[PDB]
Design a protein around this ligand. Sequence first.
Ligand SMILES: *[C@@H]1O[C@H](CO)[C@@H](O[C@@H]2O[C@H](CO)[C@@H](O[C@@H]3O[C@H](CO[C@H]4O[C@H](CO)[C@@H](O)[C@H](O)[C@@H]4O)[C@@H](O)[C@H](O[C@H]4O[C@H](CO)[C@@H](O)[C@H](O)[C@@H]4O)[C@@H]3O)[C@H](O)[C@H]2NC(C)=O)[C@H](O)[C@H]1NC(C)=O
Ligand SMILES: *[C@@H]1O[C@H](CO)[C@@H](O[C@@H]2O[C@H](CO)[C@@H](O)[C@H](O)[C@H]2NC(C)=O)[C@H](O)[C@H]1NC(C)=O
Ligand code: NAG
Ligand code: NAG
Ligand code: NAG
Lengths: 152, 422, 51, 210
Amino acid sequence: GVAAIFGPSHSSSANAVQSICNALGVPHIQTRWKHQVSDNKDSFYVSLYPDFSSLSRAILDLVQFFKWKTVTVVYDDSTGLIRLQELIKAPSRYNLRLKIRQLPADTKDAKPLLKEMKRGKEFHVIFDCSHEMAAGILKQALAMGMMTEYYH
Amino acid sequence: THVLRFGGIFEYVESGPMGAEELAFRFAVNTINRNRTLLPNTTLTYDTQKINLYDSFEASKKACDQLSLGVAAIFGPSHSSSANAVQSICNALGVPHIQTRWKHQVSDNKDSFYVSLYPDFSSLSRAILDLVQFFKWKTVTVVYDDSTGLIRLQELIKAPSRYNLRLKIRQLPADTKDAKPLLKEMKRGKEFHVIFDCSHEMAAGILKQALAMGMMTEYYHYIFTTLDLFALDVEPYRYSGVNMTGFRILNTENTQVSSIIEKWSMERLQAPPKPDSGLLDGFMTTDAALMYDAVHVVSVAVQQFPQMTVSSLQCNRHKPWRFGTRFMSLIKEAHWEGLTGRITFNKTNGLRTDFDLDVISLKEEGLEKIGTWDPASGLNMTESQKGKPANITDSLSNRSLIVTTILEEPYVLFKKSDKPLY
Amino acid sequence: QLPADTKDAKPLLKEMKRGKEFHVIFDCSHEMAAGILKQALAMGMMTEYYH
Amino acid sequence: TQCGIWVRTSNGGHFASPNYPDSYPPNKECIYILEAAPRQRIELTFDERYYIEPSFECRFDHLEVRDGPFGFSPLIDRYCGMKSPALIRSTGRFMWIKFSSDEELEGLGFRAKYSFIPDPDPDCQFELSGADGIVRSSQVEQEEKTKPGQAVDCIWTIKATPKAKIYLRFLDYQMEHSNECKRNFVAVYDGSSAIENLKAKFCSTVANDV
Ligand SMILES: *[C@@H]1O[C@H](CO)[C@@H](O[C@@H]2O[C@H](CO)[C@@H](O[C@@H]3O[C@H](CO[C@H]4O[C@H](CO)[C@@H](O)[C@H](O)[C@@H]4O)[C@@H](O)[C@H](O[C@H]4O[C@H](CO)[C@@H](O)[C@H](O)[C@@H]4O)[C@@H]3O)[C@H](O)[C@H]2NC(C)=O)[C@H](O)[C@H]1NC(C)=O
Ligand SMILES: *[C@@H]1O[C@H](CO)[C@@H](O[C@@H]2O[C@H](CO)[C@@H](O)[C@H](O)[C@H]2NC(C)=O)[C@H](O)[C@H]1NC(C)=O
Ligand SMILES: *[C@@H]1O[C@H](CO)[C@@H](O)[C@H](O)[C@H]1NC(C)=O
Ligand SMILES: *[C@@H]1O[C@H](CO)[C@@H](O)[C@H](O)[C@H]1NC(C)=O
Ligand SMILES: *[C@@H]1O[C@H](CO)[C@@H](O)[C@H](O)[C@H]1NC(C)=O
């Protein structure tokens, strides 16, 4: 007997607890983003992570305030295309040039990746990592020559 | 022996007839029970249930109801919300879970008792990428329908980084079948090469709305992703001069395959008349074909293991089932020649990443096979046919006067140079 | 000229399409100008080039 | 060129990478030449220790094992990557190994094992050196390296005086089929023989002094 369920906080298991809380009627409070399946009729869930139909507008307003033309979105797992989907669809309606890449599987060695980003003259990057792994890229972008005033 | 019991979790229609998945599962169990030469001293029994396909709690109850009653496999609730909920039950109890539609594998999910039969999109999205290079395209315009469709085509989104393309990703509206605000922007933007990522039930509704607009001439070329393109009504579109390349895993050239499909539409007398849809008559779609193979691939595994006592397992009293550890292996190294070609599974995951596609295309006689894709080979396309009488693009008075000329100074002599003049 | 009484202008409209003929002055009745436009829509002769 | 594992005993021409097995420095452009005394079905048996960088296409940081005593040869494979190669048969009397490197990499290198069994069953190599010498095309005819009635392919190595550079100049230059590079030419590959450092490829009438 409880009054709310404060989230198991992962896309595999948060959808399994959401359908329990819908069936029994108790509220399910989520604190991390989750792919809402578009035909899921659920009414007893509420999320507090800022939804990526608003964060991916804020990045799109920020790649236009900086007057960019060639961004190079780098995500980490396949869910990261659902998160930044208002930025993937952006060159259709604006003047950009998306050049989407992906970090390796679980190994924190982006040095085969950052060689291609350096040879390809890719100066504007929109990393989609967690902060625990955005630190590990910046060490490997400092060990390469990708930390000067050209890169943003 | 005590015979067997396969489980099954399918959709719950309210007033309509049975779904294409559940009826094919009921058809495949009966067909093996007729023909004795497969499973000679073993007949099958099924225990199908019906869920709401969007309620993972209902799928978890009906899975535990079949496990407590005692089954040998669970043939998939067939949706990303509820297939992940039944997969973790079948992992915990040890029984195999056979999937017949694609599902997002979360990259850190350590599961070993699932096996999929839908062709994995780390191979279909290579086959489309080999097909947008055989056609020498430079500007594709991938159109998906829901947010999961970026996970499916992710080897095609990442493609302009390593090749010379220009992706211009769009999205259909929410659930309304009105792509006419979309197709105006695709027409004004001069977008001639489209890689639709719809199901066949909604790829028909776009082509009616692309014919009502002026987007069905010989300039436009539409690769589809869906595997049920052969069951698409194409009679209004056939003389337009368009190009509609697709794929097809349902091997409708083997006479044994075509005999089953004739038995399919005969036994399916519950096929509703629906002219406003845009589809053909009752065909076995590739959703119902992969359920027909899923019963046969598991039946190979029960043939090679006559020691399989189906036990009753409670979800509350957590205890792994005895024979399921060996029985899951006998599914993964099973080979079968089903309706969808060769069936083999990738030993690392349990997915189909090795399969035989047939590249079909729209010519003025209908949909005709023009190629063959295979992950080991690539596009071995037939590709050299005449069909229509030939033309000519050269003529006389461009003949170029062979002037025989000896060399002798000052009259004719080679230029003094260093680079290879020719 | 359209065929005799058969409403199959599709052997005709292939020649009008291959011949690059974009401006047409049909002289039909309205009962048969409908039947051509269905057979000009089933072919690729209903875009913004044709008038 | 600082490729300090070579050891060259009669069978057992056992070489490994520069700074093996610690690392190898950037901009290293090693030209393991491998004389390959006539026998023995030239053997490239590698170690499992292998970090010749997994670049795409092996566009950089690669391990040319091109089957020639030179650069323009039948290529075997650009072996970059993570998994180690093994056991190239290669029935030539030769092997050319170009170990290269870019500027921003990591590495450990490789190791190589020599000497398979079988029989010894054109070969000009006019090694010229020192000061001003002469290079003559008739040296293949005076010194019986080829016979009249077959295709010729010679190599004129021109190793300098110590601490020097080389100025080629053409005294005589006359081609039997002028303005055509597919059946005769003269190329002036500098450094070592590789398709990259091709200074000039003359097959027209006049050869300029490189
Ligand atoms: C399922 O099992 C398969 C094998 O049975 C495992 O392998 C994956 O699937 C394919 C295997 O062919 C891989 O994709 C292909 O990669 C080829 C090159 O592989 C190496 O390339 C470089 C080394 O040069 C490495 O960086 C890389 O990691 C690999 O080691 C390509 O040649 C293939 O090209 C395709 O196009 C060409 C056109 O030239 C055609 O010949 C074919 O169409 C061909 O398919 C293709 O790119 C894939 O990378 C493998 N790995 C992974 C992680 O997916 C799978 O691991 C296993 N599981 C799954 C989920 O698939
Ligand atoms: C794209 O559509 C065109 C028709 O607009 C196809 O072209 C014809 O293909 C047949 C095949 O037998 C040939 O006989 C004809 O000569 C082709 N031309 C014409 C004007 O009819 C073409 O095959 C389609 N492309 C693909 C890849 O399917
Ligand atoms: C029974 O199955 C075999 C496959 O081994 C097939 O060749 C045969 O035609 C089938 N017979 C009937 C009556 O279905
Ligand atoms: C058929 O029956 C025999 C004896 O009744 C039994 O030994 C065998 O396992 C059965 N199944 C087969 C041959 O697949
Ligand atoms: C492709 O398939 C055909 C079958 O008609 C075969 O003849 C051919 O050898 C195959 N391979 C290639 C590379 O064409």
